[PDB]
Amino acid sequence: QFNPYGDNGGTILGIAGEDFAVLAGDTRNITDYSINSRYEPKVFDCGDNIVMSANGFAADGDALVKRFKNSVKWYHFDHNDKKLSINSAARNIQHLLYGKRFFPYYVHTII
Amino acid sequence: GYDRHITIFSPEGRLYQVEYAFKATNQTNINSLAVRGKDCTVVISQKKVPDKLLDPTTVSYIFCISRTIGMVVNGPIPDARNAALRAKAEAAEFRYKYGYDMPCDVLAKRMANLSQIYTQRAYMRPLGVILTFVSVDEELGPSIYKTDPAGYYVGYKATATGPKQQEITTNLENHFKKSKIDHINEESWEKVVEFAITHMIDALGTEFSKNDLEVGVATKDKFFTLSAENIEERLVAIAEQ
């Protein structure tokens, strides 16, 4: 039987300061006991001073980030170049994820 | 007067769009003829290449529908090709579904039924063509069946179509009144083609070169068209007797 999911490993970490925030991730990408890459970027600048990472199954992670980046682009077009606030970005991501409730994106996301 | 624009009845019980489609039939100014031998069915048609810039090999109104069935069209070439493509598809589909080659008369019926639908349904126009189907059918033998824009069809001992059809028709009628048989009593198809060309020459009153004619021949298990050189051989034999 075909299994549509996989595990690319990796680990990510977000910490919020007083007037700053960090999002950190390791650059290793794996399947089973093989190393696929020693440097495969996992944390992405998405515009509007928002950083994102969707760790887990890398194909679903890339797909989600790609869709959110696009969501930011279309938010600018549809609302007069207004800055997407972090709270608004978060609610948008909930709808992106819950849209595939019965065939999920296999990731843990931090912004 | 919108009863003349679409296929609905006029007060006289007429369909004017069907009648006007019949007039489109003669727009090419070409005459066709079909006759039956013992073992064969021959169809001849005038070929006119007015422009010197035309490739004469591509100018044709005879179509190979299937291996057994040929079709000559009287009418404009776009509608002729529309009808040809559909007949080809219908003949192939018939073979696939029912496991034997579509008979000439059955294809004629099918194409006539399609033509009938265009006379009853408003959104579809009639095709401005007359379709003469020919074969040597495995059950019925040599066969000529002809369809028109009314959706009418019938079998023929021989037939003619075009501007000067009546002159050809009466010429053929008078031959069969003498012989008292439904066909050309001749063994080879070559001599049946010679008969067809000869009686068209007599009826139209014009001589023909190799490039003025176009010929199709149906035998048992194949239909084929003659080349210019094959026709020339036919024209030489007519002149020599």
């Binding site: - | 006007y20 007039k23 010197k52 810039l53 035309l54 490739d55 591509t58 776009p78 529309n82």
Partner: protein
């Protein structure tokens, strides 16, 4: 009367006046030609320079279908593009199913049946272009010309648009004076001359020449545009013949 108001209506003559009106749009357009040569075909077109502000060599009119077929047209330019887009879909589905690239006669009927279908209903308008097209297949070179009715034939030479009579006369001389045939490089030169001679009908505005060709020897049976030195050589030959 009223027979010319709706597409697909036969007049009492047996004519479709809407198709004949589409031909008038074609007659109004710029001149385009086709020349069948020994091992291929050449296409050429007149591009009117409406303004100095037009960028030279940029507004390309001749279009490729698959990799072996060239298409040029006169009339409503968007209608021509729509027809080529369909031609590309037809060529793709043929190649997908049958593997071999679409033969030129096969491709000619695909366009022909599609144009003819736009004369069957009142819900659509006929095509406002005549399209000259062709290329090289397994059986050799083929040139075709397709009208708004869906009517098409094979040609030794073809011409359409405002300068068609002038062009047709010149093409007829080439057929008589070269029965054994014309070479591909000769046909490019002659194509340039014929467009320049046909420009006397559109003589108010100056123009830009555009040529393309498919030839078994000169392009490996693929459609290519004539560019650079070979284009300038054909322009010089054309300029010399008018003077």
């Amino acid at each position: 009367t009223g027979y010319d108001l709706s597409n697909s209506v036969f007049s009492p003559d047996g004519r479709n006046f809407q198709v004949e009106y589409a031909v008038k749009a074609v007659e109004n357009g710029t001149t385009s030609i086709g020349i069948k040569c020994n091992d291929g075909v050449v296409f050429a077109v007149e591009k009117l320079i409406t303004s100095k502000l037009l960028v030279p060599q940029k507004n390309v009119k001749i279009q490729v279908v698959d990799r072996h077929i060239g298409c040029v047209y006169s009339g409503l330019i968007p209608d021509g593009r729509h027809l080529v887009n369909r031609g590309r879909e037809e060529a793709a589905s043929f190649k997908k199913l049958y593997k071999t690239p679409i033969p030129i006669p096969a491709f000619a009927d695909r366009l022909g049946q599609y144009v003819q279908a736009h004369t069957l209903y009142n819900s659509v308008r006929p095509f406002g272009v005549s399209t000259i097209f062709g290329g090289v297949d397994k059986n050799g070179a083929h040139l075709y010309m397709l009208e708004p009715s869906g009517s098409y034939w094979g040609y030794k030479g073809a011409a359409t648009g405002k300068g068609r009579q002038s062009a047709k006369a010149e093409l007829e001389k080439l057929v008589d004076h070269h029965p054994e045939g014309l070479s591909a490089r000769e046909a490019v030169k002659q194509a340039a001359k014929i467009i320049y001679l046909a420009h006397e009908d559109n003589k108010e505005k100056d123009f830009e020449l555009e040529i393309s060709w498919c030839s078994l020897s000169e392009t490996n049976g693929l459609h290519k545009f004539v560019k650079g030195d070979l284009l300038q050589e054909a322009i010089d030959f054309a300029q010399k013949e008018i003077n």
